[PDB]
Design a protein that fits this description.
The structure is cut from a larger assembly and holds two copies of chain A, one copy of chain B (19 residues) and one copy of chain C (47 residues). Chain A has 108 residues and is α+β, with helices and mostly antiparallel strands. Helix content of chain A is 30%, strand content 9%. Classes of the chains: A alpha+beta (108), B mainly alpha (19), C mainly alpha (47). Chains in contact: A-C, B-C, C-D. The B-C interface holds B 3-4, 6-7, 10-11, 13-14, 17 and C 31, 34-35, 37-38, 41-42, 44-45. The complex binds adenosine-5'-diphosphate. Chain C: It comes from Saccharomyces cerevisiae (strain ATCC 204508 / S288c) (Baker's yeast).
Chain lengths: 108, 19, 47, 97
C-alpha cells in the first residue's frame, strides 16, 4: 500500500510526475537474510520477497525514491543491495576536529 | 400508495370513458 | 514461545437479513396481484 | 509559569532525598517554567527521559508521581515490563506503540 499513489500517478502522467518519497527506518529489524533466520511461521521470507518484487518488477516505475538507515549493515539481505534496488551506499562516522568545530558553530 | 393511486385514476378514466 | 501464532477469520451475516422472503421483494406476490388488477383495468380501458 | 512558590522539597511527602531532587529540578524543569519567549530565543529543546534506579521499595514511584503532580500534566500512564509481551506476531510491539 506504500506504492499505490506512485503507480496511479505514473499511469496517468508518464514523465511529468512529481517525486514520491518513502522513508524506511531501522531497515535491519525485519529485512534479514531469508532462509537463515530461525524457524517460525514463514512471515519474514514473504515480507522480503514482497519488497523485492515491488521494488524492481515486471512493471516499471520512474518516480520513487526510498531511503534506509541502519546500524548493522551485515544483517541486511544480499539481494536488496544489488544495483537498481539500493544502489548508493554511504557511511557516516564520528567527526574529526573541524567537523566538531562546524557542529559547534551551527548549534550555538 | 403510488400504485393504488394509479389504479384509482385508471378506474376513474374507465368511468369517464364509460360515460 | 512468542510471536509463534497466526490466525484466520470467519464471518456471520446479519440477523435483520434473516430469510429471503421478507417482503419488499418477496411481497411481489401481493404487489403482483395489484399489478394484475392494474393490467386488467388497463385492458378494459384500451378496449 | 505552571508552579507555585510555596514549596521547596519536603512540603510534599518525600523526606531524605535532597541533593537528588535539586539535580532533577535543575536539569528537567529548568526549561518548562521560564517564559516561552526566553527559551525560544535560547534555542533549546526539552529533556525527554529520566532513568532513576536503586534498591526496591525506596520511594521511586512516589517521587515519579509527585514530579507529575507538581507540574500539572495529565494522569500518568503506568506499565510494567513483562506485561508487554504477547504470543502473536506484531502484538508485542503494538502495545508499545
Ligand atoms: N522518602 C519517602 N517518604 C515518604 N514515604 C516513602 C518514601 N519512600 C518510600 N515511601 C513509602 O513507600 C511507598 C512508595 O513505594 P516505592 O517505595 O516508591 O515503591 P518502589 O520503590 O518499589 O518503586 C509508599 O507507601 C511511600 O509512603
Amino acid at each position: 500500500n506504500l506504492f499505490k499513489d506512485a503507480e496511479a500517478e505514473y499511469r496517468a502522467k508518464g514523465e511529468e510526475s512529481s517525486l514520491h518519497i518513502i522513508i524506511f527506518d531501522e531497515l535491519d529489524s525485519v529485512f534479514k537474510q531469508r532462509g537463515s533466520r530461525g524457524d517460525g511461521t514463514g512471515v519474514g521470507d514473504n515480507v522480503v520477497n514482497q519488497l523485492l518484487a515491488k521494488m524492481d518488477g515486471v512493471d516499471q516505475l520512474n518516480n520513487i525514491l526510498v531511503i534506509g538507515m541502519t546500524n548493522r549493515k551485515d544483517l541486511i539481505d544480499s539481494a536488496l543491495l544489488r544495483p537498481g534496488r539500493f544502489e548508493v551506499q554511504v557511511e557516516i562516522h564520528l567527526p574529526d576536529e573541524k567537523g566538531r568545530l562546524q557542529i559547534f558553530d551551527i548549534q550555538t | 400508495s403510488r400504485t393504488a393511486e394509479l389504479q384509482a385514476e385508471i378506474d376513474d378514466t374507465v368511468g369517464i370513458m364509460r360515460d | 514461545d512468542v510471536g509463534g501464532q497466526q490466525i484466520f477469520s470467519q464471518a456471520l451475516l446479519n440477523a435483520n437479513r434473516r430469510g429471503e422472503a421478507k417482503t419488499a421483494l418477496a411481497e411481489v406476490q401481493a404487489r403482483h396481484q395489484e399489478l394484475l388488477k392494474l393490467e386488467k383495468s388497463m385492458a378494459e380501458l384500451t378496449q | 509559569a505552571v508552579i507555585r512558590p510555596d514549596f521547596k522539597f519536603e512540603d510534599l511527602g518525600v523526606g531524605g532525598l535532597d541533593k537528588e531532587f535539586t539535580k532533577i529540578f535543575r536539569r528537567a524543569f529548568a526549561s518548562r517554567i521560564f517564559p516561552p519567549s526566553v527559551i525560544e530565543k535560547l534555542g533549546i529543546s526539552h529533556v525527554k527521559g529520566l532513568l532513576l534506579y536503586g534498591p526496591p521499595g525506596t520511594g521511586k514511584t512516589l517521587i515519579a508521581r509527585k514530579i507529575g503532580t507538581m507540574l500539572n500534566a495529565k494522569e500518568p500512564k503506568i506499565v510494567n515490563g513483562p506485561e508487554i509481551l504477547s504470543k502473536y506476531v506484531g502484538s508485542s510491539e503494538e502495545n508499545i506503540r
